[PDB]
Amino acid sequence: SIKIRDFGLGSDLISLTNKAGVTISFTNLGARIVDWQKDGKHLILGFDSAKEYLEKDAYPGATVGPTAGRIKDGLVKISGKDYILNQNEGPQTLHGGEESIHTKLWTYEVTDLGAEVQVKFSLVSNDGTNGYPGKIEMSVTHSFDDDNKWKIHYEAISDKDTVFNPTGHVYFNLNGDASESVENHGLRLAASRFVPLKDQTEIVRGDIVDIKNTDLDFRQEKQLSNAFNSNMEQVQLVKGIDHPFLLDQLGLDKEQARLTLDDTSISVFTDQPSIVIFTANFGDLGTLYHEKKQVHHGGITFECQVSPGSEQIPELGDISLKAGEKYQATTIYSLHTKL
Amino acid sequence: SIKIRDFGLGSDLISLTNKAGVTISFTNLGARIVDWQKDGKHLILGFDSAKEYLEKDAYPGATVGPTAGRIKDGLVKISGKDYILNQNEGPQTLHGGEESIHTKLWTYEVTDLGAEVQVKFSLVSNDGTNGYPGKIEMSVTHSFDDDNKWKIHYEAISDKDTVFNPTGHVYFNLNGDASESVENHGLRLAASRFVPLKDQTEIVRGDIVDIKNTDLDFRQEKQLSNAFNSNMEQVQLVKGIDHPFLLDQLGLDKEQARLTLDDTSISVFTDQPSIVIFTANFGDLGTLYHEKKQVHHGGITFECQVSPGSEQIPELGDISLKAGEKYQATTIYSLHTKLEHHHHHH
Ligand SMILES: OC[C@H]1O[C@@H](O)[C@H](O)[C@@H](O)[C@@H]1O
Ligand SMILES: OC[C@H]1O[C@@H](O)[C@H](O)[C@@H](O)[C@@H]1O
Ligand code: NA
Predict the structure, then answer these.
(1) Can you tell me the distance from the alpha carbon of A79 to that of B21, in angstroms, rounded to the nearest whole number?
(2) Does A74 touch chain B if contact means CB atoms closer than 8 Å?
(3) Given the DSSP bridges, would you call strands A32-38 and B222-223 parallel, antiparallel or unpaired?
(4) In contact, B106 and B122? CB cutoff 8 Å
(5) Cα separations (Å) of B124 from B4, B101, B121, B128, B219?
(6) Tell me, what CATH number does B85's domain have?
(7) Nearest-CA neighbor of B142 among B176, B115, B171, B108?
(8) How does DSSP classify residue B67?
(9) Which of A70, A278, A296, A303 to mutate to test the pocket of ligand 1 (most atoms within 8 A of CB)?
(10) Nearest by CB to A28, which of B10, B109, B126?
(11) Tally of domains in chain B
């Protein structure tokens, strides 16, 4: 079943219920996931209207870009030339800058394929928008299937050499309530390295660190409590996790990560090289979600993308997008229920 | 009464009915007017869904900007420095460039005041978008009242010094059918001067021409056919009208123009200094409007704004916008019946 309704400020809410009766919903404000529920229990964090996102936090569930993450001093090099992108966090360009793609109303079209339903959101980033060369014609297709598979398929094409590395900013919280820490969830992650941050500004420090024998080694499932409790300089620095993890084996077929709570689990697949994990290290902020005051550690992201900091650590990758080249990205979140 | 519904591609249609029973409609796709009807007769040109605007022509009824009209070589001078804007028509920047504001989904909120209903559309033009310094927080409020007044109120504030001069691209056609030429309509226009274009590229020529007593003199109402039939150089150049007219007297209180067909008339008021008129000089194109093949001269605009060409003709004005200054503009289109006695045949 498909249902579309007003979500506020002219935005729409497209709700998809699969054969199993699982519900997922997205809004064109930011080509964003709003909710994901099973048996009346929320799996992710989300708000109840457009205003909340714009007033409270515009990142949750959104498509963020054109470049996800922090870009040092807002600087990228394009065709040997420096370009300063819009600076929204101190001198850094965070998730594409101020009033980026996550705050725009994207156009969209729904395609019902039976066992699968797709919602194709579209938006054009004008040449020069927030400093980014273009125009960039972008699309983000969010699909939901009878097997409880939520897929994100990105496509983009630029009229000019530019940079492109968007991501999905959903926050999971299998407790189905923001006031409950994800400390009790188990996390498995197929990455043997992480990218340390330099300091409170959060720019990449410059090195790649081996995570073997650290509280950040999740190759073997472990309770997030372990990481939250760690004395690791990197953990103390952010008061949780806020880092890029480097995947050991690339390709969409491999289950890159798994998040579990009791009988419920979410598997992560992507064709991207890294997963940026942020554990909602908000302290006392207490942002309200469904009337629940959010707790420190009340959520966790799995931002599949090329790792931030490639401007300083080329080994991480190259987010360059040449004119006329067809950018593609695929990320899958698969829901399972232990029976 | 107000109604809302999906208009296609995620856009919405906001429909108003005033106490007199007059209906008007708008979509957030380009903070645009979609229809205006009197007794089941369309007063303007418009399509039936969002895809038609995007597939056929994205300008009709839209809010265009940041700068309406043609900017030669896309060059503007901002606070002493030159900036090249997006070039979408040869080397010119036409209507703010490619995939501009008329093509975005603006957010909106409706305020019901009873006798008047306001539909405020909002959009942020990021710093650097299409070459424009910014960021610019814009809003376009389209309102309709029991007095048959359709008002357009623009507001904007930029973070940086930039340029700003948007307009409303509504096309009237009192025949209620695009396949019927507006040659049969009477036009009165309070302008003694116009701005000639250089050639087919349509940039301004450089001079201001006096049009008194020519076929482009509408001070005293005359049929549009007088202009269309004219062999004046400027008319032949564009195959009709596609020009800025300079208002002789400024102020929102003055009826600057009036378009009449039989008992129906549209009056134009504005706080802007010129009205750019385009008479849908599409020749044999035939874009379909409600399944009607649009005819050459099947429509007419009254885009109130600062005349295009101030880059070469400083006398026309200055479209610059200082960082932190609040820009405002107001244009009103008012519907009336039996104001005068328009009984003609063509
Ligand atoms: O990824 C986005 C998040 O990045 C974190 O480093 C910040 O502390 C959050 O405020 C922000 O929402
Ligand atoms: O104002 C926009 C209009 O300008 C005219 O000069 C062009 O010929 C039209 O195709 C265009 O829609
Ligand atoms: Na809507």
Answers:
(1) 60
(2) no
(3) unpaired
(4) yes
(5) 23, 9, 11, 12, 39
(6) 2.70.98.10
(7) B108
(8) B
(9) A278
(10) B10
(11) 1
- CB neighbourhood size of A323 (10 A): 13
For residue B207, what are the domain limits? 1-346
CB atoms within 10 A of CB A290: 14
Q: Whole-angstrom Cα distance, residue B86 to residue A263? A: 55
Distance from CA of B8 to the nearest CA of A (A): 8
* Gap between the Cα atoms of A59 and A61, Å rounded: 6
**How far is Cα A243 from Cα A69, in angstroms, rounded to an integer?**
10
C-alpha to C-alpha distance for A201 and A194, rounded to whole angstroms: 17
Active-site residue, selected from the candidate residues B42, B102, B142, B169: B169
Residues with CB under 5 A from ligand 3 (ion): A 10, 12; B 12
Q: Which atom of ligand 1 is nearest to the CA of A69?
A: 1
Coil, helix or strand at residue B136 = strand
Locate the chain A residue with the closest alpha carbon to B137. A99
Angle at B309 between CA B304 and CA B310, to 5 degrees: 90
B303 Cβ below 6 A of ligand 2? no
Using CA atoms, how far residue A44 sits from A172, A230, A290, B284, in Å, is 4, 25, 11, 55
CB count within 10 Å of CB A16 equals 23
Tell me the C-alpha distance between B277 and B260, whole Å: 16
Q: Is B303 considered catalytic here?
A: yes
Distance B102 CA to ligand 2 centre (A): 14
Q: At CA B128, angle to CA B124 and CA B131, rounded to 5? A: 115
For residues B2-18, one letter each, b for 16 or more C-beta atoms within 10 angstroms of the residue's C-beta and e for the rest, the string is eeeeebbbbbbbbbbbb
Q: Whose CA is nearest to atom 3 of ligand 1?
A: A278
Contacts for A310 with CB less than 8 Å, ≥ 6 apart: A316, A317, A318, A319
Mutate to test the interface with B, among A105, A106, A109 (most CBs of B within 10 A): A105
With H, G, I as helix, E, B as strand and everything else as coil, classify residue A33.
strand
Contacts of B162 (CB under 8 A, 6+ apart): B66, B78, B132, B133, B134, B136, B320, B321, B323
Q: How was this structure determined?
A: X-ray
Mutate to test the pocket of ligand 2, among B171, B278, B284 (most ligand atoms within 8 A of CB): B278
Residues 6 or more apart from B46 whose CB is under 8 A from it? B25, B33, B34, B35, B60, B61, B289
For the beta carbon of residue B329, count every other beta carbon within 10 angstroms: 21
Separation of alpha carbons B21 and B39, rounded Å: 8
Say whether residue B147 is in contact with chain A using an 8 A CB cutoff: no
Question: Inter-chain contact A105–B4, Cβ cutoff 8 Å?
Answer: no
Angle, alpha carbons B31-B102-B327 (nearest 5°):
65
Is residue B345 annotated as part of the catalytic site, yes or no? no
Beta B23-27 vs B11-17: how paired, if at all? antiparallel
> Which structure tokens are listed for A337?
């229920």
Q: Give the C-alpha distances (Å, rounded to integers) separating B320 from A121, B44, B168, B201.
A: 35, 31, 19, 24
Active-site amino acid positions of A: 169, 303
Q: Which of A169, A181, A171 is nearest to A296 (CA)?
A: A181
CA B138 vs CA A194, B63, B125: distances in Å: 42, 11, 7
Resolution in Å, one decimal place: 1.8
